[PDB]
């Protein structure tokens, strides 16, 4: 047996296609050592944060609420840290994360999918087929966005240019 993504490497044996997005890529082998449900929830949580973050970086350059002073997004962090606005965001995120801990227990028991928080306000996913397309898409967008996050945070560090301005410039 060999992994589909990388031909020379072997199929991990816990990656059997059970979870969407499985291409057999697990060279280190963490899937064997640890429960995959934890890792899939972590992957979705990390990716969802990253997808939001890359959009947030771009949008903040495009438009900013007037009351707060306009700042570079990477360095905005420090101003919010002193102001107390950043603490407010952390507290609410932590409050939701508390419920996330209970949800993690639900996943371990088997009552919950790894990343399912039953969020369908706009009812975008009409049927199972469109949901399947969306879940594979969400995995890809999360993975790519995790790469993209730090893509221009690190670029900001080498070159002090807004990612939009940097993209146009040079």
């Amino acid at each position: 047996d060999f992994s589909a993504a990388v031909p020379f490497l072997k199929r991990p044996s816990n990656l059997d296609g059970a979870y969407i997005g499985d291409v057999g890529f697990d060279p280190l082998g963490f899937s064997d050592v640890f429960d995959l449900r934890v890792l899939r929830e972590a992957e979705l949580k990390h990716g969802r944060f990253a997808m939001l973050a890359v959009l947030g970086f771009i949008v903040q350059e495009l438009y900013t609420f007037p009351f707060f002073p306009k700042m570079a997004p990477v360095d905005a962090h420090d101003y919010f840290v002193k102001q107390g606005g950043g603490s407010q965001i952390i507290f609410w995120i932590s409050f939701v994360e508390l419920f996330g801990v209970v949800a993690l227990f639900e996943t371990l028991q088997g009552k919950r999918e790894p990343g399912d928080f039953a969020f369908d306000p706009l009812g975008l996913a009409k049927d199972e087929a469109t949901l399947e397309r969306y879940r594979l898409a969400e995995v890809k967008h999360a993975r790519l966005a995790m790469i993209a996050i730090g893509g221009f945070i690190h670029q900001y560090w080498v070159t002090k240019q807004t990612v939009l301005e940097q993209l146009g410039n040079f």
Partner: protein, 126 residues
Amino acid sequence: VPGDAGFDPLTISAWLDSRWLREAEIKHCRVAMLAAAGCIAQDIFQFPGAALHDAAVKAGSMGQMLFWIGFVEAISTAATIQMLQGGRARMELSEIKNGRLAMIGFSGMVHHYFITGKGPIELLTS
């Protein structure tokens, strides 16, 4: 199997795994062929805006290359461990023979540069 000439005076094959040895030889063959081709080609033409290792490390080219090669090697190490756990043929023979040839030629080219401070093809022209 390819590149077998029954050459083992020191009988290294008995005391080390064959799969590791042949994989090590093929990796060395590939690196050597690339390096010898690069040494002749680089004298022929210069890439735009670009002992040479020192200039490169100051430029920073080697450091980024090291990170990307290291990533490929880390992914590869899982594969080599898996192998240790457990006309195309003519192309394999050509790949190993040309590689062995480069492993000799490149070593000559670098040592030639120590002696004369010249690239191999230019040295002959001069």
